[PDB]
Symmetry: D2
């Protein structure tokens, strides 16, 4: 569905549930009832983010509540990604090639799902670079080599030396950091954020 | 919070969780990395609904996921409405004054909460006008008089004669209709959609 | 649905999603595979709360996850309560008849919905008795008289004199207290927790 | 927390939100007010599943609502699993060694997370054995060899030959089946249910 059509149907839904008519709503917004009716007819495409903010406010709700869901990109409930179409993204922390993100399949039917094959470039734990924790839990699996894992307080953290085949879970907002085992050059792991 | 600032922070959050940088994102959108950086700096206010649709799509998520929540209009967790500031809205079904909606307090911290004092104008059950059911459950309480309630199939519905003080619950999407008891003139009830 | 049958189906579901068979599960619990199979066949009725605790633990989940939902008590999506079948419950704070709760309709399809007609017995604000705030938001409507509302810090609270017909919203965990307006004897309000 | 203590605190919470006192609740259950008070004091451990069913019913809610959450087994937000402590479970479909499940790390803070390394034993697509779809989405990654994937209608399904390194997503309730590519002997993949 388009932003316009989704908005058109949801706006009408919301307007009706708070008992307003085109006239009533048009008044609170300083618009004409025809304008409002136009939106409800799919002509809202050029409304600005700020204007959408006002409409949501007047309807005592959020912009998200008035916009359609992510959408559906599945092929009969499935979506596949070949190994050569994986987007690559160099990760840099403190002007260093820390990670290399090879992005796996993603779908608008589960936006929070972000699976990655991560090349861990550095192999000096003492130079581990912490992220500040992030929303969503994360599942990890060591694909190759040994990983030196660090989590918690970046000043005084807990650590773990993980052999190939190990698997771990990091709750959301828990700060963590990885490097390959001391001197082993590099390691590789699968990270699934969900 | 504004639409612009909320968008700016959420866009950055999302861009980072799918591992893209300004360059990567700017490319999929056919924009310049400076443009994207501008959005992330609160300058997205004039983006159109349709453009927001594209950005969401490229980031494999929804517009709602990139926009801030409804907002907070409470006064230390509370919000009050005096009886004279209630918005009134005449309800018309089949060119008739069916209901009269007196809207009670609402808050952006619970958008689905829509409480109403409803004047039931007609008193001829045989002329009951059905709504087609709606999202969200609804709690009813008969404030004055007797209500003749109808729900289910509008062709062959179930009925109930409700005395003052009665209370009922209607699950979402269950079509219903009300009128005052046969010949009793009018009735009044409290309807709380949540 | 029964506790036994719901448990039987959900236990099997969970056992299968963690890839265990009767033997595997029976082992972690110190039971025989036949015992486990019995549970999955509706014979778990006499399992104790503590035993259910162990089963949940071994299956790394909660007891709730292994038990059926509240159930359905609706009559085609609706449930009605006549004014004379309302359960009455005297409310006492500091050995005083503070409130009188007349409980309205409730349903297992929305357990959090607790609507009440509350008789406010005291009319001395200075003797207001605070609750410590509670889970779930609450919608209030003054049915009769004047209410003296208090919320926030019980040591230094905010106040509001509410006329008949006023409506208010109290967010969850916000401590509040009510009495009838100073010297007006008593008042009455509708309180809907959802 | 224990089943007993969690129940004790939640029962009290629920009893209070529906305005009942020990006497009122004890009456609907055919128990003594002291009995009820005992439960609220952690002595409910021996209550049977069926009895818990009644208590939930009387309180118009679910057993889950009266029992504590799964619990917390993390070590400062993290939990690790070494490759040799992975529980193994042979998978059999039609009296054949179809799969071999090597279970990875799991946590009570995300019960729906069930990650597995799956050895795909058969390599004859024509003999693919379908599951009937299951709750929860699933992320797959081909670890070794080639997988012949099948999903949808088991009578007339869609197929995909997946090379090592491919990744896929299967929405919940979509029936699927895997085997190694025709004649290639065996394959191995990572399956993450969340
Ligand atoms: C293995 C990748 C890490 O979890 P990130 O969330 O990118 O810091
Ligand atoms: C009393 C008003 C009815 O519930 P509606 O939802 O407007 O049809
Ligand atoms: C009117 C009753 C109050 O809201 P309580 O939640 O009982 O303190
Ligand atoms: C790869 C394993 C399958 O997805 P299952 O859910 O076990 O049938
Ligand atoms: Fe991470
Ligand atoms: Fe309605
Ligand atoms: Fe309250
Ligand atoms: Fe599966």
């Amino acid at each position: 569905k388009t932003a316009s059509t989704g908005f058109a149907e949801l706006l009408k839904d919301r307007r009706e549930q708070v008992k307003m008519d085109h006239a009533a709503l048009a008044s609170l917004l300083g618009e004409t009832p025809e304008t409002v009716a136009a939106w409800e007819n799919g002509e809202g495409g050029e409304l600005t983010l700020t204007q959408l903010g006002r409409i949501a406010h007047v309807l005592g709700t959020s912009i998200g509540a008035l916009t359609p869901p992510a959408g559906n990109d599945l092929d009969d409930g499935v979506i596949i990604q070949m190994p050569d179409e994986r987007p690559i993204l160099k990760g840099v922390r403190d002007n260093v090639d820390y990670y290399v993100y090879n992005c796996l399949v993603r779908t608008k039917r589960a936006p929070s799902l972000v699976p990655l094959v991560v090349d861990v470039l550095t192999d000096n734990p003492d130079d581990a670079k912490f992220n500040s924790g992030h929303a969503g839990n994360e599942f990890l699996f060591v694909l190759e080599g040994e990983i030196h894992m660090k989590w918690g307080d970046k000043e005084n953290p807990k650590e773990a030396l993980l052999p190939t085949g190990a698997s771990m879970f990091v709750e959301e907002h828990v700060p963590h950091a990885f490097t390959a085992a001391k001197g082993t050059g590099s390691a590789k792991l699968i990270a699934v954020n969900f």
